[PDB]
Amino acid sequence: QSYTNSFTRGVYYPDKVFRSSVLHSTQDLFLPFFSNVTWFHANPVLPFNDGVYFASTEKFNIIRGWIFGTTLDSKTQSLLIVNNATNAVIKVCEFQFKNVYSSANNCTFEYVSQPFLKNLSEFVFKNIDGYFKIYSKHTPINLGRGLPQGFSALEPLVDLPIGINITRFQTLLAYYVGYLQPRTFLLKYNENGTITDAVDCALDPLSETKCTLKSFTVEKGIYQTSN
Amino acid sequence: QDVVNHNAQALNTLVKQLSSKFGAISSVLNDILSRLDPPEAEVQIDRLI
Amino acid sequence: FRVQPTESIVRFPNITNLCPFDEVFNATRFASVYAWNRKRISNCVADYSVLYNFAPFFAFKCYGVSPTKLNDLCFTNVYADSFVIRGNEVSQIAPGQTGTIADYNYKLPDDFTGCVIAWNSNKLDSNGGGNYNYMYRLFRKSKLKPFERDISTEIYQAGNTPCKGVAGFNCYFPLQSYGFRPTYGVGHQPYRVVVLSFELLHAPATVCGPKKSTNLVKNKCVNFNFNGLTGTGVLTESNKKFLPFQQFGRDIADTTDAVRDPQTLEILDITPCSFGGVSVITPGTNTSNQV
Amino acid sequence: VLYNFAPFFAFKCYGVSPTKLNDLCFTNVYADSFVIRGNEVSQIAPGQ
Ligand SMILES: *[C@@H]1O[C@H](CO)[C@@H](O)[C@H](O)[C@H]1NC(C)=O
Ligand SMILES: *[C@@H]1O[C@H](CO)[C@@H](O)[C@H](O)[C@H]1NC(C)=O
Ligand SMILES: *[C@@H]1O[C@H](CO)[C@@H](O)[C@H](O)[C@H]1NC(C)=O
Ligand SMILES: *[C@@H]1O[C@H](CO)[C@@H](O)[C@H](O)[C@H]1NC(C)=O
Ligand SMILES: *[C@@H]1O[C@H](CO)[C@@H](O)[C@H](O)[C@H]1NC(C)=O
Ligand SMILES: *[C@@H]1O[C@H](CO)[C@@H](O)[C@H](O)[C@H]1NC(C)=O
Ligand SMILES: *[C@@H]1O[C@H](CO)[C@@H](O)[C@H](O)[C@H]1NC(C)=O
Ligand SMILES: *[C@@H]1O[C@H](CO)[C@@H](O)[C@H](O)[C@H]1NC(C)=O
Ligand SMILES: *[C@@H]1O[C@H](CO)[C@@H](O)[C@H](O)[C@H]1NC(C)=O
């Protein structure tokens, strides 16, 4: 259980709208730049908070699923995503895990899609107003400490209209876990509509100046930012 | 350059003001017309106006 | 002046499934007030006309939308909450209402948008079983938040003395059952109540009314209705590279300038129809009337 | 203590919220008591 710098990772398209060559300001739950992310080389149950940023880099496909919920028992509903070499299945049944699940009962929603999963895989899980939103991205990386310094946005992988209660989560078997805070970001959409860069308006005075000027470049002078 | 920038900025602000709600339920007049009957649409339309 | 539109086009997807309003409304036993049954409605054609074939309802009160406009709107998702209440309490099912049912059993948001439908149920819920045993919560420490269900059977401790889970003095049982009888007057008759809550905008629309999809017209000033997105303009082929999850595009001013067709899955650029000022050039009327 | 005297069906407050009462200071209070018919209770309101 170590700590690592998140750099600029953890940026996702906040909405379905298309924009080209724009600097757009969005207030939403994001992973702050250069934040501390927990690093696991193994998987204890972790709190969920507002949202979760997840990163994996294994080549053996050891990481094969996530569990979300409050009690993680049959007392309350527990979201369960399991990926296998062919597909990815999602359920909201009440489970009694023991270590797949010893017992399952009272299923409400089920879903099947293409499997979610060096080849770094990044995910963002949010649970807001009865919607579970999953954003995902897969990028080629090289060997190193982890979480390279490049920039890549996370496209919306899936949305689930399940009004469940989530406060904790756990993974199923070197992965990185970070948390999301309500931040205002300045995203850059290039000519093709791809988010190529972003500014975290609360990172430092320079980023606040950039957000106030709605630009990535600041001319010499003194600028009156927030009070 | 300052004159040109001031004119462009004023026009951009004037156009951006069409996205505000001003206390209405929506900033699009067609949505108000297609979602509400006249007696209830009048309040929202006046708030936009 | 302004170029007037020539045609009107509606573009809805191939979704033809009828929304399961039948099972929601034509259910043998509705749940109690404190345990109102909520169902999700999505990915179907919401034909509200069939609702008129299920009951001559005495209440069809809609907030934020007109009842006659429902067949021409697209919704992202719908919540259907069903229960059985007393008639005189039906008025409590509304935003900004204070009462036992409104605050302790079922609460609506201030910004609630949707409809409420209540109809008679004396002929079907005056019998035994749960029909005569319809219950509701009477006491609670604090008012329920909007869209919240509390089915706990905790004993309400009115006094300071602890109850230890046993009903007694100042230790009441909040879950009180109705006494619905056919002999009661209109002030105590049971009514079945269904509340529809719609969610508009944001997510792509998947619940739409029974509106036919017409042909696609390009390079002409027309009215367009793309999955509830209403507008007027000229549709052309566009070179914009929409990502697979993206539906419509906006400019710097945040005005919709591109749209993905629900059926053909192509990207159409939208340009407002031509307009401008008209000027009359004239010598003085003392000279001539030509302009 | 008012909650220990009756399970009242009406606690309608104008210009103040019922839950905020314990955190407010008042200069003076008038308490007007009577007995009415139930259907007429709604008539006890401003602009009625
Ligand atoms: C990350 O943690 C280390 C030690 O726990 C601390 O020194 C460092 O300041 C933290 N980084 C941030 C950005 O808070
Ligand atoms: C979710 O669960 C937590 C504890 O398990 C509880 O405190 C919270 O009130 C619950 N929220 C909802 C909306 O059920
Ligand atoms: C993966 O899991 C799904 C879910 O049951 C199953 O249908 C599929 O056959 C599995 N794939 C393999 C290769 O076993
Ligand atoms: C499953 O759901 C039903 C319906 O609410 C309930 O009666 C039953 O107790 C549930 N199962 C368990 C093990 O509690
Ligand atoms: C990484 O994985 C993604 C999806 O599994 C794939 O599209 C991409 O080509 C992979 N990258 C490399 C370098 O193989
Ligand atoms: C945008 O896409 C076009 C073709 O899809 C490509 O030629 C161009 O290089 C791209 N621009 C950028 C900045 O990636
Ligand atoms: C409900 O369905 C039953 C059989 O499906 C039918 O006999 C009855 O008339 C229906 N009632 C209403 C109100 O639709
Ligand atoms: C809808 O049906 C038409 C009829 O053939 C077909 O051409 C079109 O591809 C379909 N589109 C979708 C999104 O199903
Ligand atoms: C009123 O006071 C009498 C005696 O002082 C007591 O027996 C009775 O319970 C009280 N009633 C209420 C509603 O406080």
From Swiss-Prot, chain C:
Domain BetaCoV S1-CTD per the UniProt entry, residue ranges: 17-210
Effect on the protein of changing F169P: In strain: Omicron/XBB.1.5, Omicron/EG.5.1
Region (Immunodominant HLA epitope recognized by the CD8+), start-end ranges: 131-139
Protein name: Spike protein S1
UniProt-annotated stretches for the region Disordered: 2-18, 138-173, 202-224
Organism superkingdom: Viruses
Outcome when changing A158V: Increased resistance to neutralizing antibodies
Known glycosylation sites: T6, S8, N14, N26, N286
Intrachain S-S bonds: C19-C44, C62-C115, C74-C208, C163-C171, C221-C273
Effect of N14Q: Reduced viral infectivity
Residues included from the entire protein: 318 to 608 of 1273
Gene that produces this protein: S
Effect of Q176Y: Reduced host ACE2-binding affinity in vitro
Assembly mode: Binds to host ACE2. RBD also interacts with the N-linked glycan on 'Asn-90' of ACE2. Cleavage of S generates a polybasic C-terminal sequence on S1 that binds to host Neuropilin-1 (NRP1) and Neuropilin-2 (NRP2) receptors. Interacts with host integrin alpha-5/beta-1 (ITGA5:ITGB1) and with ACE2 in complex with integrin alpha-5/beta-1 (ITGA5:ITGB1). May interact via cytoplasmic c-terminus with M protein. May interact (via N-terminus) with host bilirubin and biliverdin, thereby preventing antibody binding to the SARS-CoV-2 spike NTD via an allosteric mechanism.
Organism encoding this protein: Severe acute respiratory syndrome coronavirus 2 (2019-nCoV)
Function in brief: Attaches the virion to the cell membrane by interacting with host receptor, initiating the infection. The major receptor is host ACE2. When S2/S2' has been cleaved, binding to the receptor triggers direct fusion at the cell membrane. When S2/S2' has not been cleaved, binding to the receptor results in internalization of the virus by endocytosis using host TFRC and GRM2 and leading to fusion of the virion membrane with the host endosomal membrane. Alternatively, may use NRP1/NRP2 and integrin as entry receptors.
Integrin-binding motif: annotated segments: 86-88
Outcome of substituting T230K: In strain: Omicron/BA.1
Chain segments carrying region Receptor-binding domain (RBD): 2-224
Outcome of substituting G179S: In strain: Omicron/BA.1
Residue ranges, annotated region (Receptor-binding motif): 120-191
UniProtKB/Swiss-Prot annotation, chain D:
Renumbered residue ranges of the record's region Integrin-binding motif: 37-39
Effect recorded for L2I: In strain: Omicron/XBB.1.5, Omicron/EG.5.1
Function of the protein: Attaches the virion to the cell membrane by interacting with host receptor, initiating the infection. The major receptor is host ACE2. When S2/S2' has been cleaved, binding to the receptor triggers direct fusion at the cell membrane. When S2/S2' has not been cleaved, binding to the receptor results in internalization of the virus by endocytosis using host TFRC and GRM2 and leading to fusion of the virion membrane with the host endosomal membrane. Alternatively, may use NRP1/NRP2 and integrin as entry receptors.
Subunit-level organization: Binds to host ACE2. RBD also interacts with the N-linked glycan on 'Asn-90' of ACE2. Cleavage of S generates a polybasic C-terminal sequence on S1 that binds to host Neuropilin-1 (NRP1) and Neuropilin-2 (NRP2) receptors. Interacts with host integrin alpha-5/beta-1 (ITGA5:ITGB1) and with ACE2 in complex with integrin alpha-5/beta-1 (ITGA5:ITGB1). May interact via cytoplasmic c-terminus with M protein. May interact (via N-terminus) with host bilirubin and biliverdin, thereby preventing antibody binding to the SARS-CoV-2 spike NTD via an allosteric mechanism.
Protein name: Spike protein S1
Species in which this protein is naturally found: Severe acute respiratory syndrome coronavirus 2
Native organism taxonomy: Viruses, Riboviria, Orthornavirae, Pisuviricota, Pisoniviricetes
Parent-protein residues present: 367 to 414 of 1273
